[PDB]
Design a protein around this ligand. Structure first.
Ligand SMILES: *[C@@H]1O[C@H](CO)[C@@H](O[C@@H]2O[C@H](CO)[C@@H](O)[C@H](O)[C@H]2NC(C)=O)[C@H](O)[C@H]1NC(C)=O
Lengths: 48, 49
């Protein structure tokens, strides 16, 4: 049960939650701050 | 120097009631959230596990 809870928490880092990419560095390489903050708030909300 | 000793008795039966289980519901997430929509079912996969 502990290992399954941690595996589930780690696999959730790979989810998009509605952002263009589930990788934070893709958003910050591809996008400038005004639009990038919109993609990052989706990842913050999903990861939180 | 005083003691009281019971000279008779009563057998009492007292009921006690305890919960032991509860209804085994299961709610399927995709059928609850979306229900037959493929459009919704695809959006829900972005939220992962
Ligand atoms: C102890 O108490 C019981 C009743 O709690 C007594 O037996 C009863 O006595 C009364 C009065 O004589 C009768 O009307 C009842 O029919 C009896 N039986 C029951 C089951 O209540 C008993 O006599 C008492 N004994 C002592 C030690 O006094």
């Amino acid at each position: 049960q502990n290992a399954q809870a941690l595996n589930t928490l780690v696999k959730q880092l790979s989810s998009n939650f509605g952002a263009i990419s589930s990788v934070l560095n893709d958003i910050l390489s591809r996008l400038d701050p005004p639009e990038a903050e919109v993609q990052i708030d989706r990842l913050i909300t999903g990861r939180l | 120097n005083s003691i009281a000793i019971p000279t008779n008795f009563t057998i009492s039966v007292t009921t006690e009631i305890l919960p032991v289980s509860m209804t085994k519901t299961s709610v399927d997430c995709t059928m609850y959230i979306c229900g037959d929509s493929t459009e919704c079912s695809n959006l829900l996969l972005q939220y992962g596990s």
